Structure formats: C-alpha cells, structure tokens
C-alpha cells in the first residue's frame, strides 16, 4: 500500500541537522492531516511500504526562521515500515491510534 491521504503510516527515521544525529526512532502518523513536519510528509507522499529513502527538508518546509536552529536543512533517512488505511475513529480524531482498541475522545 502507498503512502497517501488518510493512510496511517509507520516510519523508522534518523534525523540529522548539520551532520549530527538529533533524534531517531519509529512513529506512526495519520497522513494528510498536518501532523508531521510539512516537508517530510511531502517526501513520504506516494512511497511504497518497505521503501528506504533520504529527504532534505529546507527550513521553509519545516521550522523556518524560528527553528525550535534557525534556517536549518533537516536531513532525514526514512524507512516506510507499514502503511494501512485509517479507522473511522482515527479520521474523526484526525490522528493515528495505537493498535489496541480503546474507545475515547478528546
């Protein structure tokens, strides 16, 4: 299944800024709901499950002048671990949910 609108996507990633590993790990997100760094999601669009790729995200498609460093290019190494369609609850909440059932709201 390909990454696209309303897919819940699991990625393994390493984030580098100016050659220094800032953060790495694995996370799942609901695609197409502005829940990721904008440039990263754009780079993930249309990727197949199992794909490994690098993405350069300029500050303007991320944190801009403020940063969170200013004007940094984010250097992502990404693995698309899993792609699935969202549940109705995920779509109405606008975010991905853990696999275990637990009815809730926010």
């Amino acid at each position: 299944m390909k990454v696209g609108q309303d897919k819940v996507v699991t990625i393994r990633y390493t984030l580098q800024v100016e050659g220094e590993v800032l953060d790495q790990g694995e996370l799942s997100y609901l695609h197409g709901h502005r829940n990721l760094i904008p440039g990263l999601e754009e780079a993930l669009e249309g990727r197949e499950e199992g794909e490994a790729f690098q993405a350069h995200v300029p500050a303007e498609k991320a944190y801009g002048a403020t940063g969170h460093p200013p004007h940094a290019t984010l250097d992502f190494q990404v693995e698309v671990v899993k792609v699935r369609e969202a549940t109705p609850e995920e779509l109405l909440h606008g975010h991905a949910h853990p696999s275990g059932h637990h009815h809730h709201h926010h």
Partner: peptide, 6 residues
C-alpha cells in the same frame, strides 16, 4: 517531538 509535534 519535532518530527511529529504534540
């Protein structure tokens, strides 16, 4: 949480 903000 910089990749997927809280």
């Amino acid at each position: 949480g910089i990749v997927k903000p809280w």
